[PDB]
């Protein structure tokens, strides 16, 4: 069952500023919205088993284009479009082909994957401007595991973790036009990026079960000690089925 379309959206790099990347993220979390807590939207998941929902991402920089598709109930990339004949590659994990007559990667979307195919650490990557133009340019045309890795890690820092993560945006908008590299601060990868799914979990369950315990959490070297203010870190909030069960379970 190959992961539909739910919608697209396009931007150009060419102009890009601060502001207009801000503005970028922010409508994408609206885009992607199904409901809202303390107005932070909410991913879709109701829909399971057997309806993966996705959509699509355009990049163009100087005539040059590359389409990313990414799970919408996640945000995790699953392949991406080349210019020249229009070949989708799909990233390895997700179920047959997500993408239909995708060519299958040697890598799957987690940084772990994507680094080793890099063959070069997430923090060691740049994700200023320039680094974005140059992942459209090689994700347009190259046939080289190293350079698809390292840019897919470009698209799915700049696009996917700044959607999840307020701070993270902040720090791609505050940088963006700098002409020295743009390194990702081991806070946000450390406590943010790796906890997004635990903290989302955290955070609806809180919602929604008056039996769970809110363990306080560690960020920046912050103790962080209500879901409320945990909450106020994430641009957008994953939905696991387990936040649906029925409260106040045996245990």
């Not at 799909?90 to 047959?96: D, I, K, N, V």
């Not at 200023?128 to 045309?141: E, M, P, T």
């Not at 903290?199 to 879901?227: R, V």
């Not at 957008?236 to 106040?248: A, K, L, M, N």
Request: net charge negative; aromatic share 10%.
């Amino acid at each position: 069952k190959a992961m539909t379309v739910k919608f697209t959206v396009e931007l150009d790099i060419e102009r890009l500023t601060g502001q207009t990347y801000t503005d970028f993220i922010k409508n994408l979390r609206r885009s992607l919205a199904t409901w809202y807590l303390h107005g932070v939207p909410v991913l879709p998941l109701y829909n399971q088993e057997a309806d993966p929902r996705g959509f699509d991402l355009k990049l163009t920089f100087r005539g040059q284009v590359t389409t990313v598709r990414i799970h919408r109930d996640d945000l995790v990339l699953r392949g991406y479009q080349m210019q020249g004949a229009g070949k989708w590659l799909e990233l390895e994990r997700p179920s047959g082909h997500l993408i239909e007559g995708s060519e299958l990667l040697e890598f799957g979307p987690s940084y772990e994957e994507l680094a080793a195919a890099a063959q070069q650490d997430i923090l060691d990557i740049s994700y200023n401007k320039n680094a974005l133009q140059d992942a459209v340019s090689k994700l347009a045309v190259s046939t080289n595991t190293r350079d698809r890795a390292r840019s897919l890690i470009v698209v799915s820092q700049m696009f996917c973790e700044a959607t999840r993560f307020v701070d993270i945006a902040n720090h791609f908008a505050f940088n963006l036009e700098s002409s020295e590299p743009v390194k990702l601060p081991q806070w946000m990868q450390n406590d943010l990026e790796k906890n997004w799914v635990r903290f989302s979990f955290m955070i609806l369950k809180s919602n929604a079960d008056p039996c769970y315990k809110f363990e306080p959490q560690t960020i920046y070297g912050k103790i962080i000690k209500t879901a409320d203010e945990l909450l106020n870190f994430l641009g957008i909030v994953e939905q696991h089925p387990d936040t649906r069960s029925p409260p106040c379970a045996a245990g």
